Design an enzyme around this catalytic site. Structure first.
Site, PDB file in Angstrom:
ATOM      1  N   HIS A  69       0.875  -1.183   0.000  1.00  0.00           N
ATOM      2  CA  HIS A  69       0.000   0.000   0.000  1.00  0.00           C
ATOM      3  C   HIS A  69       0.908   1.227   0.000  1.00  0.00           C
ATOM      4  O   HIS A  69       1.888   1.252   0.709  1.00  0.00           O
ATOM      5  CB  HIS A  69      -0.942  -0.028   1.226  1.00  0.00           C
ATOM      6  CG  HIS A  69      -1.954   1.077   1.245  1.00  0.00           C
ATOM      7  ND1 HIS A  69      -1.632   2.380   1.577  1.00  0.00           N
ATOM      8  CD2 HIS A  69      -3.279   1.079   0.984  1.00  0.00           C
ATOM      9  CE1 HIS A  69      -2.708   3.141   1.497  1.00  0.00           C
ATOM     10  NE2 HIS A  69      -3.724   2.376   1.140  1.00  0.00           N
ATOM     11  N   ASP A 129       1.062   4.336   1.240  1.00  0.00           N
ATOM     12  CA  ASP A 129       1.353   4.932   2.545  1.00  0.00           C
ATOM     13  C   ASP A 129       2.302   4.023   3.356  1.00  0.00           C
ATOM     14  O   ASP A 129       3.192   4.517   4.057  1.00  0.00           O
ATOM     15  CB  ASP A 129       0.054   5.201   3.337  1.00  0.00           C
ATOM     16  CG  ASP A 129      -0.752   6.419   2.822  1.00  0.00           C
ATOM     17  OD1 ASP A 129      -0.230   7.255   2.059  1.00  0.00           O
ATOM     18  OD2 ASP A 129      -1.935   6.570   3.207  1.00  0.00           O
ATOM     19  N   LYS A 130       2.134   2.707   3.250  1.00  0.00           N
ATOM     20  CA  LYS A 130       2.942   1.777   4.045  1.00  0.00           C
ATOM     21  C   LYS A 130       4.309   1.507   3.405  1.00  0.00           C
ATOM     22  O   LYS A 130       5.277   1.168   4.118  1.00  0.00           O
ATOM     23  CB  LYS A 130       2.191   0.472   4.322  1.00  0.00           C
ATOM     24  CG  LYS A 130       2.103   0.108   5.805  1.00  0.00           C
ATOM     25  CD  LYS A 130       1.152   1.050   6.566  1.00  0.00           C
ATOM     26  CE  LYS A 130       1.262   0.927   8.079  1.00  0.00           C
ATOM     27  NZ  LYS A 130       2.508   1.557   8.635  1.00  0.00           N
ATOM     28  N   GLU A 186      10.902  11.642   6.124  1.00  0.00           N
ATOM     29  CA  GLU A 186       9.585  11.545   5.488  1.00  0.00           C
ATOM     30  C   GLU A 186       9.736  11.003   4.061  1.00  0.00           C
ATOM     31  O   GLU A 186      10.532  11.523   3.289  1.00  0.00           O
ATOM     32  CB  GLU A 186       8.925  12.928   5.476  1.00  0.00           C
ATOM     33  CG  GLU A 186       7.678  13.053   4.611  1.00  0.00           C
ATOM     34  CD  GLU A 186       6.932  14.354   4.852  1.00  0.00           C
ATOM     35  OE1 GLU A 186       7.523  15.457   4.747  1.00  0.00           O
ATOM     36  OE2 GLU A 186       5.732  14.266   5.150  1.00  0.00           O
ATOM     37  N   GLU A 196      15.325  15.555   7.704  1.00  0.00           N
ATOM     38  CA  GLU A 196      16.543  16.019   8.348  1.00  0.00           C
ATOM     39  C   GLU A 196      17.155  14.896   9.138  1.00  0.00           C
ATOM     40  O   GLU A 196      16.479  14.266   9.946  1.00  0.00           O
ATOM     41  CB  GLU A 196      16.223  17.191   9.274  1.00  0.00           C
ATOM     42  CG  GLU A 196      15.949  18.489   8.518  1.00  0.00           C
ATOM     43  CD  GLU A 196      14.669  19.174   8.972  1.00  0.00           C
ATOM     44  OE1 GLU A 196      13.630  19.073   8.263  1.00  0.00           O
ATOM     45  OE2 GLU A 196      14.706  19.800  10.051  1.00  0.00           O
ATOM     46  N   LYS A 241      -5.503  -4.365   1.192  1.00  0.00           N
ATOM     47  CA  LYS A 241      -6.290  -3.695   2.220  1.00  0.00           C
ATOM     48  C   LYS A 241      -7.276  -4.703   2.761  1.00  0.00           C
ATOM     49  O   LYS A 241      -7.970  -5.387   1.988  1.00  0.00           O
ATOM     50  CB  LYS A 241      -7.047  -2.472   1.673  1.00  0.00           C
ATOM     51  CG  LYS A 241      -7.854  -1.702   2.729  1.00  0.00           C
ATOM     52  CD  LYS A 241      -8.840  -0.697   2.125  1.00  0.00           C
ATOM     53  CE  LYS A 241      -8.216   0.675   1.835  1.00  0.00           C
ATOM     54  NZ  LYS A 241      -8.200   1.598   3.017  1.00  0.00           N
ATOM     55  N   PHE A 244      -7.668  -5.367  -9.985  1.00  0.00           N
ATOM     56  CA  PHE A 244      -6.725  -4.587  -9.194  1.00  0.00           C
ATOM     57  C   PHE A 244      -5.332  -5.069  -9.616  1.00  0.00           C
ATOM     58  O   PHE A 244      -4.621  -5.771  -8.883  1.00  0.00           O
ATOM     59  CB  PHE A 244      -6.975  -4.805  -7.684  1.00  0.00           C
ATOM     60  CG  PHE A 244      -6.101  -3.963  -6.758  1.00  0.00           C
ATOM     61  CD1 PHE A 244      -5.362  -2.850  -7.214  1.00  0.00           C
ATOM     62  CD2 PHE A 244      -6.063  -4.264  -5.395  1.00  0.00           C
ATOM     63  CE1 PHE A 244      -4.595  -2.099  -6.335  1.00  0.00           C
ATOM     64  CE2 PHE A 244      -5.302  -3.505  -4.510  1.00  0.00           C
ATOM     65  CZ  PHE A 244      -4.567  -2.422  -4.980  1.00  0.00           C
ATOM     66  N   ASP A 258      -3.273   6.179  -5.640  1.00  0.00           N
ATOM     67  CA  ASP A 258      -1.892   5.731  -5.826  1.00  0.00           C
ATOM     68  C   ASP A 258      -0.797   6.550  -5.044  1.00  0.00           C
ATOM     69  O   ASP A 258       0.357   6.096  -4.962  1.00  0.00           O
ATOM     70  CB  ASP A 258      -1.554   5.683  -7.343  1.00  0.00           C
ATOM     71  CG  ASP A 258      -0.575   4.539  -7.731  1.00  0.00           C
ATOM     72  OD1 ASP A 258      -0.048   3.805  -6.851  1.00  0.00           O
ATOM     73  OD2 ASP A 258      -0.325   4.377  -8.951  1.00  0.00           O
ATOM     74  N   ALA A 259      -1.124   7.724  -4.480  1.00  0.00           N
ATOM     75  CA  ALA A 259      -0.111   8.523  -3.742  1.00  0.00           C
ATOM     76  C   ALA A 259       0.093   8.092  -2.260  1.00  0.00           C
ATOM     77  O   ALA A 259      -0.870   7.910  -1.509  1.00  0.00           O
ATOM     78  CB  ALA A 259      -0.429  10.001  -3.812  1.00  0.00           C
ATOM     79  N   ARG A 268       0.584   8.399   7.679  1.00  0.00           N
ATOM     80  CA  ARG A 268      -0.836   8.524   7.379  1.00  0.00           C
ATOM     81  C   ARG A 268      -1.624   7.244   7.626  1.00  0.00           C
ATOM     82  O   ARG A 268      -2.771   7.172   7.217  1.00  0.00           O
ATOM     83  CB  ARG A 268      -1.028   9.008   5.943  1.00  0.00           C
ATOM     84  CG  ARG A 268      -2.400   9.612   5.633  1.00  0.00           C
ATOM     85  CD  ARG A 268      -2.387  10.471   4.369  1.00  0.00           C
ATOM     86  NE  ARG A 268      -1.908   9.741   3.181  1.00  0.00           N
ATOM     87  CZ  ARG A 268      -2.147  10.088   1.915  1.00  0.00           C
ATOM     88  NH1 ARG A 268      -2.847  11.176   1.594  1.00  0.00           N
ATOM     89  NH2 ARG A 268      -1.657   9.339   0.949  1.00  0.00           N
ATOM     90  N   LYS A 269      -1.030   6.268   8.320  1.00  0.00           N
ATOM     91  CA  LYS A 269      -1.722   5.047   8.786  1.00  0.00           C
ATOM     92  C   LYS A 269      -1.574   4.845  10.337  1.00  0.00           C
ATOM     93  O   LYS A 269      -1.269   3.779  10.842  1.00  0.00           O
ATOM     94  CB  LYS A 269      -1.225   3.855   7.999  1.00  0.00           C
ATOM     95  CG  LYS A 269      -1.638   3.886   6.548  1.00  0.00           C
ATOM     96  CD  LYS A 269      -3.025   3.290   6.365  1.00  0.00           C
ATOM     97  CE  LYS A 269      -3.559   3.525   4.973  1.00  0.00           C
ATOM     98  NZ  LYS A 269      -3.967   4.934   4.802  1.00  0.00           N
ATOM     99  N   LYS A 308      11.164   8.277  12.549  1.00  0.00           N
ATOM    100  CA  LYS A 308      11.563   9.025  13.725  1.00  0.00           C
ATOM    101  C   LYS A 308      12.399   8.159  14.641  1.00  0.00           C
ATOM    102  O   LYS A 308      11.966   7.083  15.016  1.00  0.00           O
ATOM    103  CB  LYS A 308      10.335   9.484  14.497  1.00  0.00           C
ATOM    104  CG  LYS A 308       9.527  10.581  13.831  1.00  0.00           C
ATOM    105  CD  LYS A 308       8.266  10.839  14.630  1.00  0.00           C
ATOM    106  CE  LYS A 308       7.338  11.780  13.895  1.00  0.00           C
ATOM    107  NZ  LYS A 308       6.150  11.989  14.745  1.00  0.00           N
ATOM    108  N   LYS A 315      12.237  10.983  19.741  1.00  0.00           N
ATOM    109  CA  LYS A 315      10.870  11.495  19.626  1.00  0.00           C
ATOM    110  C   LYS A 315       9.977  10.740  20.608  1.00  0.00           C
ATOM    111  O   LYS A 315       9.699   9.543  20.423  1.00  0.00           O
ATOM    112  CB  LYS A 315      10.358  11.358  18.201  1.00  0.00           C
ATOM    113  CG  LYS A 315      10.921  12.423  17.263  1.00  0.00           C
ATOM    114  CD  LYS A 315      12.426  12.320  17.086  1.00  0.00           C
ATOM    115  CE  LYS A 315      12.906  13.087  15.854  1.00  0.00           C
ATOM    116  NZ  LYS A 315      14.392  13.260  15.822  1.00  0.00           N
ATOM    117  N   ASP A 371       6.906  10.852  21.041  1.00  0.00           N
ATOM    118  CA  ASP A 371       5.729  10.321  20.351  1.00  0.00           C
ATOM    119  C   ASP A 371       5.890   8.846  20.020  1.00  0.00           C
ATOM    120  O   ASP A 371       4.945   8.104  20.108  1.00  0.00           O
ATOM    121  CB  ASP A 371       5.427  11.109  19.092  1.00  0.00           C
ATOM    122  CG  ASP A 371       4.639  12.391  19.362  1.00  0.00           C
ATOM    123  OD1 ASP A 371       4.151  12.605  20.506  1.00  0.00           O
ATOM    124  OD2 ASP A 371       4.486  13.168  18.384  1.00  0.00           O
TER     125      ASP A 371
END
Lengths: 360, 365
Positions: free
Chosen positions: B14, B16-17, B42, B55, B156, B225, B228-229, B234-235, B255, B259, B261
């Site tokens: 996927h 995002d993954k 990122e 960075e 998915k 199937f 696509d971005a 974002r998951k 990260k 961090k 988080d």
């Protein structure tokens, strides 16, 4: 039980928020001309470059360059960015083309949350965070703090007391603010202004005291943006729960948006009617099925009435099939740009924020 | 009360993954050479183009092209037929890398995190997210073993479980719905694919006692199937508890351990799971909050949903006596300088007993 809780908000100039807003500006531009428009618009940006992707079925004639550029101008880039000169690359593909009993498009899970601790039936943390950023935007736009730029981040930590399930804000523990700025202005001038013109103006004085910690421009003097990556900021700032669905650039046919709004509407109505001080509403949908699979009401111990009693009230007063929600919340209107910053919830100008009078 | 709950997982392919996993491969690359590398990596990807932003402060000498391409290959994209290929894709590296020049170090951020756990599965995780994850892992296994060579990397899953409330605990009764969409080769039909997903994926993973003749199956629901971005972070719900518990907002991948988080999200999981395995509660949400430049948490809250005999205050006592949740000590206790982050970036950060935050600590009380 004393605890602290922190929520965050980012400015209109945050790249993720630039994309959310642009995406919903495109949604609105289609809804102005064609309420039956279907719009899945994903924006991506990277310093001097904006990329619109996605799929549109619509009869509207939308000047995409004008919309995007107008949105960038509105955000305040006119700074590392400019509406007259940035690369706007439009990739999206516009094809051309029961009612209240159409099944949900996705296997959705959505939460709605309300708390009595504010007028807006929202957590103080997230409201104060959104309002601080809006205050800066107001002061920047009006020319009163001309050194301000559109990118910012604010965090507010509130120190709470528990009250048998309810939560009482007692004091502001910490406020953190960073904001982009022009060069001709000092660190001390910016901090003075943020404390006096932003914080004092937004935060009820009764919550501020001599021990409140202020991290203003903490890293001294000031990445890629995408749509749909600020989902906690957009909703409840860590309160309640989230099923994962982002909002911006999705039209009314997407239950992740429309039913999230309705879930909020229900929760807010339950608190306003005096049936609880605090509530989490959980509603799940099956693909191709109109009626939700289930509705759960959790009052954190703050209701005289039971869950099942509240559920019966919800059934009597609401119809949460996607098609009826769209009608009842008037969700084909071009109102989505306004939702894309400062939180989708808490602002009374949205129809999901006007509480429904409950008969029970 | 009866209720239905749905959780989602997405496979390694996927978009995002792909990004989360590339971002954490970069992190690992750095940590193999410099245990104290500061990484904020990122990843973006869109049709044959991967972009690395962010960075890094590190002594490590990293071949970015090779790390990105090895990750894409490992995910399984190795030819133009799949719409993406480790040989021919453009890896556009934009990172600015710099060079550099304790238990009471302050948290780098004003942070709030949640840990959650539940007795409903052996992994102390909600059944909905665990099944979703295992269905994607099962497909990945059968794709790599050659047993279902039509499978491709992107997928998915959604699992709707029907639950019964039980004095604040939640008991799974049955699987209400399963949604699977998985990418595939051209020479297989929808009908074969669906049969195989039922017989080789679902039957292998989901306990028989939860499946019945009313369980709904939406298998390849949008049809074919073939192709696509994506971005990092974002998951966030897929990565954690799949809608259960709560989320403060902090994404993990790309990260390093400095961090909070990431590090305190893992410690908060560890604490929650430790409480349930000690027998102190059946279900628990732990909330921990930090202040910038302060080591000690500002507060630790513990909600057991009416499932503990001990009070919140008494359970807080137990946590105080058994855990030290300062960022500096977290990283020591959970071995967070070890380069294992690429493994966390698909199939969820919580539930898998190979991570130190998933080994419960024996609690003195």
């Amino acid at each position: 039980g004393v605890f602290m809780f922190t929520s965050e908000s980012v400015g209109e100039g945050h790249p993720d928020k630039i994309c959310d807003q642009i995406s919903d500006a495109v949604l609105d531009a289609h809804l102005k001309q064609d309420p039956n428009a279907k719009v899945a618009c994903e924006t991506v940006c990277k310093t001097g470059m904006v990329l619109l992707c996605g799929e549109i079925t619509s009869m509207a004639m939308v000047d995409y360059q004008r919309v995007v550029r107008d949105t960038i101008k509105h955000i305040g880039y006119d700074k590392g960015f400019d509406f007259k000169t940035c690369n706007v690359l439009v990739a999206l593909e516009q094809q051309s083309p029961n009612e209240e009993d159409v099944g949900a498009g996705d296997q959705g899970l959505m939460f709605g949350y309300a708390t009595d601790e504010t007028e807006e039936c929202m957590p103080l943390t997230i409201i104060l965070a959104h309002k601080l950023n809006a205050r800066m935007a107001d002061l920047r736009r009006s020319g009163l703090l001309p050194w301000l730029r559109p990118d910012s981040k604010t965090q507010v930590t509130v120190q709470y007391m528990q009250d048998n399930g309810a939560v009482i804000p007692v004091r502001i523990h910490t406020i953190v603010i960073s904001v982009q700025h022009n060069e001709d202005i000092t660190l001390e001038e910016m901090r003075r202004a943020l404390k006096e013109q932003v914080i004092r103006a937004v935060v009820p004085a009764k919550y501020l005291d001599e021990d409140t910690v202020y991290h203003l421009q903490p890293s001294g003097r000031f990445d890629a943006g995408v749509t749909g990556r600020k989902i906690i900021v957009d909703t409840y700032g860590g309160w309640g729960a989230h099923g994962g669905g982002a909002f911006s650039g999705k039209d009314y046919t997407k239950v992740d948006r429309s039913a999230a709004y309705a879930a909020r509407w229900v929760a807010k109505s339950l608190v306003k009617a005096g049936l609880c001080r605090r509530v989490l509403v959980q509603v799940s949908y099956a693909i191709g099925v109109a009626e939700p699979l289930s509705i759960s009401i959790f009052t954190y111990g703050t209701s005289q009435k039971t869950e099942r009693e509240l559920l019966d009230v919800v059934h009597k007063n609401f119809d949460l099939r996607p098609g009826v929600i769209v009608r009842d919340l008037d969700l084909k209107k071009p109102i989505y740009q306004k939702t894309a910053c400062y939180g989708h919830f808490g602002r009374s100008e949205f129809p999901w924020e006007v509480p429904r009078k409950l008969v029970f």
